[PDB]
C-alpha cells in the first residue's frame, strides 16, 4: 500500500501538473477564511455547477514576506499526495497578480469551531479523529513529508464527519533532520523551541497536544504570550483533567515525551506503538482508513520566481 502510494506520489512530485483551469471559469461566492497572503473563497465551477474552495495568494505579498519556497512547495505536495484524510486539489493556476489553488469544498467547517462550541469531545469522539491523524502521519512520514502544523484549525470535517487536512504551508520533504522555527506555539515540540535539529517525531508530539485539546477543551500548555507557553512545553510538566481515562493519560505521557528517544512514534516499532496502545484497542484501523466506522458527529464558517507553479 505504502510502496504503491510512494510510487504514485513520486511520479506526480517529479512531474507536477500546472495551469489546469482559469479565474473566469469560477463564480466567486463568499470568503470562508483568511491568511497572510490572501483568502479562501466558496466558489462555483460555472460549466458543471460544482462547488470548490479557492485559495487565492498574492504573489507580490508572498515575495514581500519571503515565503516563495514554502508557497511553491505547498501546491507541489497538494498535487502529488493521495489519501482520504487530505483535501483533494482539483486545479491550480496563476494570473498577473495571483496563485490559485482550487480544492474540494469541505462544508462541515473547522474542527476548531465544533470543539469551542461543544467545549470538549468525549474520549470515543476524540479517538475517532486521533486515528485519522495517526494514519495520515504514517502516510506522510513514509513519503518523507514532515507536516509541522497540526491543530484543530487545520482540520476540516466533511459530510461523512471525517477529517480533511487542508494546509501544507510548513510541510517539508526531508528524510532526516531540519531546523526551521515554524508551527503554532501551543503545538511546538520542545526540540523545535530549544532550537535543535529536529525530525518527524515533532508531528507525534503535536498529536499528543491535539488528543489532549480534543479531550479537555484546552491545550496542555497555554499562557498569554508564546514565550510563556515555550517554558511550559520545555519543562514537560503536564496536568491532566480528572475525567481523562488511565489509558488516555498513559498514551499522552508517551506522546508528550520531551525525550524523543522515548517518544511514541519515534521508537523502533514506530507508529505500531501508538496503534497497539490500550487507548486504541477498540479502533478498527482498516475501517477508519476505509471510512466504514460511523462518525460520532455529522455537521459552519465565520463571516469576513513562481515559474514552477
Amino acid at each position: 500500500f505504502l510502496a504503491k502510494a510512494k510510487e504514485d506520489f513520486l511520479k506526480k512530485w517529479e512531474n507536477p501538473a500546472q495551469n489546469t483551469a482559469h479565474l473566469d471559469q469560477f463564480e466567486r461566492i463568499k470568503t470562508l477564511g483568511t491568511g497572510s497572503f490572501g483568502r479562501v473563497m466558496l466558489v462555483k465551477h460555472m460549466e458543471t455547477g460544482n462547488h470548490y474552495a479557492m485559495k487565492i495568494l498574492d504573489k507580490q505579498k508572498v515575495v514581500k514576506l519571503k515565503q516563495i519556497e514554502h508557497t511553491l512547495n505547498e501546491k507541489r505536495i497538494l498535487q502529488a499526495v493521495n489519501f482520504p484524510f487530505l483535501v483533494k486539489l482539483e486545479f491550480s493556476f496563476k494570473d498577473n497578480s495571483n496563485l490559485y489553488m482550487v480544492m474540494e469544498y469541505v462544508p462541515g467547517g473547522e474542527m476548531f469551531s465544533h470543539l469551542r462550541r461543544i467545549g470538549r469531545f468525549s474520549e470515543p469522539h476524540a479517538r475517532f479523529y486521533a486515528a485519522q491523524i495517526v494514519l495520515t502521519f504514517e502516510y506522510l512520514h513514509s513519503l518523507d513529508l514532515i507536516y509541522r502544523d497540526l491543530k484543530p484549525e487545520n482540520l476540516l470535517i466533511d459530510q461523512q464527519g471525517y477529517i480533511q487536512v487542508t494546509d501544507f504551508g510548513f510541510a517539508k520533504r526531508v528524510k532526516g533532520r531540519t531546523w526551521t522555527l515554524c508551527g503554532t506555539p501551543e503545538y511546538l515540540a520542545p526540540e523545535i523551541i530549544l532550537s535543535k535539529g529536529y525530525n518527524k517525531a515533532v508531528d507525534w508530539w503535536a498529536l499528543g497536544v491535539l488528543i489532549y485539546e480534543m479531550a479537555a477543551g484546552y491545550p496542555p500548555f497555554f499562557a498569554d504570550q508564546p514565550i510563556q507557553i515555550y517554558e511550559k512545553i520545555v519543562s514537560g510538566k503536564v496536568r491532566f483533567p480528572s475525567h481523562f481515562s488511565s489509558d488516555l493519560k498513559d498514551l499522552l505521557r508517551n506522546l508528550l515525551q520531551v525525550d524523543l528517544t522515548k517518544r511514541f512514534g519515534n521508537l523502533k516499532n514506530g507508529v505500531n506503538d501508538i496503534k497497539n496502545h490500550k487507548w486504541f484497542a477498540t479502533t478498527d484501523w482498516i475501517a477508519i482508513y476505509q471510512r466504514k466506522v460511523e462518525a460520532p458527529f455529522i455537521p459552519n464558517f465565520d463571516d469576513y520566481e513562481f515559474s514552477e507553479f
Binding site: 476548531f112 469551542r116 502544523d149 491543530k151 484549525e153 504551508g169 510548513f170 522555527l181 515554524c182 508551527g183 503554532t184 506555539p185 501551543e186 511546538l188 479537555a216 477543551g217 484546552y218 497555554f222 499562557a223 498569554d224 508564546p226 496536568r239 483533567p241
Partner: peptide, 18 residues
C-alpha cells in the same frame, strides 16, 4: 480552574503560526 485559566489567557480563538 484550568478552564477559567484558559479563558484568562486571550488564546481561546484561532491561533496563527509563528
Amino acid at each position: 480552574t484550568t478552564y477559567a485559566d484558559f479563558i484568562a489567557s486571550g488564546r481561546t480563538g484561532r491561533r496563527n503560526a509563528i
